[model samples]
Target: NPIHDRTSDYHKYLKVKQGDSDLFKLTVSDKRYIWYNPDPKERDSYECGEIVSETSDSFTFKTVDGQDRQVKKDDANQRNPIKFDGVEDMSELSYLNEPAVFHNLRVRYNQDLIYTYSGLFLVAVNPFKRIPIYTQEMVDIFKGRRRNEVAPHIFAISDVAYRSMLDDRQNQSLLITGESGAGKTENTKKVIQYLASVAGRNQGVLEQQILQANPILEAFGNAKTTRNNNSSRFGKFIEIQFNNAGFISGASIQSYLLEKSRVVFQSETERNYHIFYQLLAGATAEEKKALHLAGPESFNYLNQSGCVDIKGVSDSEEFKITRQAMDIVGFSQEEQMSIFKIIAGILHLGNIKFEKGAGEGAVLKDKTALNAASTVFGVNPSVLEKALMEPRILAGRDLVAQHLNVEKSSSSRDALVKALYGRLFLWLVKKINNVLCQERKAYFIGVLDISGFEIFKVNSFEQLCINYTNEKLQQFFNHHMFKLEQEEYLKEKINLDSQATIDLIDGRQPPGILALLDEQSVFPNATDNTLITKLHSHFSKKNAKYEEPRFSKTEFGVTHYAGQVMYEIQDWLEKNKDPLQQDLELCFKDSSDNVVTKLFNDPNIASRAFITVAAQYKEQLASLMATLETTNPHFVRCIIPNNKQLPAKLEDKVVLDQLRCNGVLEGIRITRKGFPNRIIYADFVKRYYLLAPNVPRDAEDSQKATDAVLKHLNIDPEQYRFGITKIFFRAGQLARIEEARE
Candidate 1:
């Protein structure tokens, strides 16, 4: 009861301070607060304590555990000691628990504070509007300061990774992940901008080229969706390489799993890729006439959405930016023209319709559409019609022609569009990488800005791939934070659980959900119904994490670590097969355009290859994981403040659901129980040996000498452990010893 009363009193105090006119200018002694003790040995780390005594030069504080200590006034780390009036960083909270963490974040969100720190993780709330937090002055402030030394900002995360890369001479990765419309792409842009600003030094051309690549990629790879005005339709991992002196040398981008289906179909409220509309709105009259473009309303693919324009955006201006980016990235005039021609060809291809012929085959009803497409791709209209109507096939020793019905012909058209757009996106990425490549051997800082976990009303294969990717990312988070750390604890005679929650989503023995989906994909005769039946038969009784939905025969549910996402398996087989006809391949191969011809030169190899969509996605994901494992990883978890996309509105249920699903609670629990800080023996001695003046400066055995220093300083042996190369400390243990020494 007394504890409850104290917490109520603390909230009242917070309310009073928040209502004051000068919240930021208030001093530590002006309010009862959570104070951080600033010692060089333990900087920016705080405890749940209150100021008990004050002087002009120093203040005495009593921690929640009832220990009183005096701290200097002008200490570099103690510039702002009080955690009051909606502290910017949640790590500064007096109580480090879930409720307190959630409260701090909620208060900050109400005040338009979107970025906060939770130990090693950076938590971001979508503001839904642009803020001026990213300026040259802000970048200067965070350049070399420790993360705790500055207010919570994304720039601080970049600065930390930059410093670590230089200090330890190792590769680093910033894993920026969140759900759709959660501002992951924006934050990823900020990270790249910050790195460029600090590492540019003299503003090399390559650095400018790397920065300009964003607009070009977004033009082709982003679209207007119901959730966000500008949503990325692909996943990208941008790696910026630096020389030994920390100057930018070169950069490369690796994109994954582009949503190519948007080229053929989009929902009523959603639009296709931005490039299509940009060309229509911005291209010159001659350019438009040459590509057979009329307007967005002319093409079935663009008009089907019934929503072409986006609010507060000028397609003409976007078109200009894309052209500028393409030029800066070293694309010549001819090369640029070739890229747009392919886009125009796809648009024209969408207009071609088929009707039942006199016999049992299909006939092209719109000869004009075929002519336009053929002109754009430099192919004969007759050849294009032949390829669309029926195709020559080789059956054993006989030359046979296959006849396609109206339905099959339409499907073939959609397939060709998807294949062309998919390959075109990959080729664009390769071109960008080629321009940004350098010959020197340089270390890189990679930033992965990928699609997040998705569950929609009509969940399809695309949703499955995106959610499966998120599952893998979540598994990585759990392995790094809990599984591996707990293993070390087990070896140190600390009792901890060996089994991890990751097994729920990716268990190999019982063929986890991903494995099951993969198995179903290999069967040529498998349908959505067959896939669900197999899943139910394998997992319904054996695994608690999987189940068959009571309402729908085509849908099954998986209780992912985040939450339950029921998947509709419609078109699973067709989507995974992703088939392309031999005749269509031959048409591209016979084109006059070198780029088009080169893309489809190997018809035999292309026809023989039959990698399922699920299998291809899994392989790409495995490669990404391998790349992440070889680097020192940093995580940024982005959260949407509300589902309405409104500014400054914090919906409680929405925010809490995201927090639970994103592993924030699990991270906090592990940070509380496991050791949160580690330092190599050499750095540990250099920073803390002053507490024990008797230790030799040139000690031969660094580990033994470090242990002696800790013993001499009276550090609790139970609160720390010495591993093969580093000394790990329990949460806040080093700060306690630092305060005592001071």
Candidate 2:
């Protein structure tokens, strides 16, 4: 497990994709990863942090950690010399200890350096305010550079993936796994922007279309949580297609599981979908009257979140952006038509609240909103009222009329609105797919900008997201090689623990969690309690993957690689069952509106909608897994700076909490075991050539000089790999070269 002795095949990994440079001379040393402070009073104790290169008087080590101060032989009193300040790579330090790891990120974070390298991932911290590190020139700065050469940044991370795509002629995938308010989307945005510049921007037409795509998805998926001003409730996967020349061709968006309840009932201080709020403010005086729109004051949080007013937000501009996004993504007039109709329809529909008087036949409640929605959606008003109150029921296939109770009636109405909204999203995504598939697709860079994975005794969509992220991930980290080479590595070695859990949930022979859930799903006798009874009975103790809670019978834990999530059985049975009412589908399928008709009547569309959503997710995720099997996967572990969701803030506990789970320290520490550092031959000899006597500073054929220098230092032949364009040195071996002098 020690850094210096470990061997890895990840060498052939990046080299499989596919570099040059010049020189300087400097003293050498054997100071490989040789600093740490096991001292108290410091929040986290330090580790063996090596100083890489030394300037004429100062050390490059000092620069790497942002320590401009010199360590005078006598005056430096700390037992460890400059015992860690900040760093680019966690691998630079050996112990991989706790506080040292934290203090460095905490140190560099204040410098507004949100991106850092932890071997395998580009760990990003959210900087609430724009430091403009993402400016166009910065994108220019990151182009085609080796990972070791560039300072840690999202641009570099993406450039690495993009070049790997071109270098190996393989599709690239980067999954942004993190908490919601973190820098997830920002990284994806920058990556999209970088690719547009690299492969998509030549025309700027498609590039602009790709750039504006976010405003559209955000309008539908973003909301104001009390925690952050703008947060994404739903998670999305974006595929940017490129041709062989590495020019972007077209791209499509895939977003999932919106917070449907937000449409009907939003939480405190949280706003409704962006479209609802923007609809009121951004609609013209002319259009406002047409829709019979009212004010935020009039519409309760009952209509939107009560605390809708956020400082410096202009829904008007947001609407304009959203409007433009629709146009750019090719949402036609007929397409845009029923979409807004559904929005305003939901607004009017919310007012159709019922009281005790409405319980029996489901009325005495006003039908004003009912009629309003009928006209808006272009359905029969009398029939719509019947659908709401006394839709046809199945008494063993004898179609008898049934009247819902007040609670059932209200739920019916809510379900209808959510249904309409969900379908509209599917249509929009489809339209996006149509436009983005504009040209021949030769390669792709798929970025999944997702919310956090922490479960609230959660499953269904939440479990789906976590598992979806995990699938591409398994292919990434265990990257043994292509195809069966992959099967051979993970199928045998890792092949067991994590993959067992995947099968435990995803497989059939074992009757996985998803598989078992489907069994109880069709049972008429199934209650939430009954469904859970079967779950624990089938899963607990028999398999190491599922756990019966130590005490709580109401909840059981299912183990996945990330961790064990104890899912509450409450409402899961109901949540997994499709809520679409036949009466409503029957109503909307015959709408006068083209979009409304398409949302309901499409043959293939209904097939997706009728499901134990667990089935759909598993099927859809399996399909995604199949697609990735043909491509390469990249992992970017997006790290959040704080929970407060603000600027100038990185709670140590908050960051450290996440850093432990992600690769920043140990993720990279593990990767570091595999020759974690690489640079070109010319770049490698600049410092070490001095130690090699008679080596020319202005040497031609820079490749030979590198080997000559390493040979002069008598470095172990096992410590490095020499390739055509570059050579990769094992973690801390370069430190061994320099540590000898100090």
Candidate 3:
């Protein structure tokens, strides 16, 4: 078959929502795929690595003659493994001359790569570098140029995702996955930037509101991490459901694990997200005195100038941006001031000093702190003292207060102040998300800036929390896929509701997983009553169903689960459809159930609500199910190498190994079924490496690289049909395994 010409409807194929694609409809009878790598330098056409030894600990593979043997285990340059791009039709893909690892690895057709990357694995590409094309028009509001305007590369990939969601009737999900420093959060902002710009075309207030939402979210959600100076440690999923008209309908933000402890504290070497320093540095001395803050120097990284000194990063700038966001979200000046005052009060509260007064254990001796707090919060200094020292009467009532015994009151007041700050942050994020949710209707293109699945030397409770969150999300995908299967049966009027049927269809026991994870519920002492909590507690024990649950306790309660999981919980709750059939109208309606009751009195109203509710549920459920129909499909990992003169290099060995482990795990868990085939481009390159030893690398090398890649991944190479696997390589030295043929 000829290589797919420009006529190839890759974009069109992805946008399929209502019906199957022509290719899919035709291939439905017998589905097959192939892998192709076009980059020549990365083609791995070396001698087939032969496995000389295999074990749980490690494995050894040698060349045909055994002279060029390589011992590979969990830690070998796993980056050289096969690649999987989710393109389903590969019959026309060119072949390369190489033998790589990932043959027929699992992939999903047009899967929201952003979501996958954010939640489970790390990809090199930045998800947030999106192109914004939407323009604010008075008549239409969100109307922007329909043509591409942002970065071409990001635009192309984003366009594919955008069209796929709108067409496939499959609810479009974007996963932004990368390390903290790799710009996951920034990429997420760009994704939303693109969606809002494109989706909110011609709408007046709506466009303005959507455009302003990002800064607000960032202020509360994003933070600094070790990898990237500024990073997001949580995951998010924004669903863009469309109505019959191509106009915007609705949007919801689903957040993942957030490293919340960072808000209160940070490591010695690492600074918290810029917000912390911004808050400290940007605030005026008067504001600091009012907030009771000593200075940024009081904190570890907050005192630093590196991230703080960056342009457009002053606390004043953040204050302005935050204020703008608040106003755009309809927050009145009073409400906005109230929020800032709360922040200020917390800051002042942090600076409050205590001393031994008479026989009293602790007393606020800092009269200046009292005066500052009183002025900022509008409370009397005397009243502030009474509140700080002990319970006292205020506002025509007795105000209860706790006293701190230490001079600095470091432990008590600090904790209380931090707690208040955290509450304020949550309130702000939820408030903003709610404001945005009101305008969301049929479709939403959400950008998630959440943490990815993590593993460390000593995984603990936090890891468990984060990994569990991932598990639940994966389960959600599985459930969606199962629902798709059920819908198929429904279309055929078939009743398929057995346990096995449920298992096969659901791909996971979501409720069961939820049940096990429900720490809120109590079963019994060592009985089912306490099962979930107990199971989590005993996860490391031999009998624990899962041997090594990844996560642990850190500065935050749990390192993995500690971050923005709660915020994500809120986003999920807001986005989830109402369970009750009768509540559907009430679901979308902000009015009290009273409005629904009144509407129910009118036959037309009732009929309209019923139709709307039923149709909405049907559509949402159908889209979810359809996505699962191709769960864990094959992936053709495309390796885009730099030019011969400018090859990419592996910076760190540890980071590389972890990257591979994460990638493999992601490949395994992403599918409703399991891991399938994989391809590596480097293998193709190695196979043809000798051929290009002398020739100045040119288009010929590029073309040959693609051919060599395709040949290596083609299943025809082996009788057993190992499933096409191709791995790309660059001209530079990789971090993990040095090219060694012993």
Q: Could you say which candidate leads in lDDT?
A: 1
Better of 1 and 3 by TM-score: 1
lDDT of 2 by residue, 268-370 (tens): 7778878887878888888777666777665543444567656898888888888888988778866676777778777877777665553366763577777
lDDT of each: 0.75, 0.68, 0.40
Instruction: Evaluate residue 222 in candidate 2 and report its C-alpha lDDT on the 0 to 100 scale.
Output: 79
Q: What's the lDDT for candidate 2? A: 0.68
lDDT per residue for candidate 1 within 1-742, as digits (tens), equals 2112434432222122333353222332443444453443642233445677779988777765777777775431222223333765544443344545666787677666778777557899998877667777556767887875656778888999999999999889998888888999999999999999999967578878999999999999999998888999999999889999888888889888788888999988999999999999998999999999988999988999889999889999999999999999998888888788888999999998788856979987658888888888877788778787787776778777788998888889888888878777777787888899766846889999985677677777777677777777777776776555666666654441112323534456767655676677777678888877877887775766667887788887776666777888787777777877778887887888755664576442233245566666777888988998888888898998877789978765577667777777677766756565555687667655566766665666888888878888778888888876777777556545544341
Question: At residue 674, what lDDT does model 3 achieve?
Answer: 22
In model 1, which runs have C-alpha deviations exceeding 4 angstroms? 1-85, 94-97, 393-399, 482-524, 602-609, 672-742
Per-residue lDDT tens digits for candidate 3, residues 241-360, read 346555555555544444545645665456655555556666677856545565666543354433334433466677677777778878777665555565555445545667786665
Clashes of each: 0, 12, 143
Q: What TM-score, over all chains together, does every model reach?
A: 0.78, 0.81, 0.53
Model 2: residue 735 alpha-carbon error in angstroms: 5.4
Task: Tell me how far the alpha carbon of residue 176 in candidate 3 is from the true structure, in angstroms, after superposition.
Answer: 2.6
Cα deviation at 597, candidate 1, in Å, is 1.9
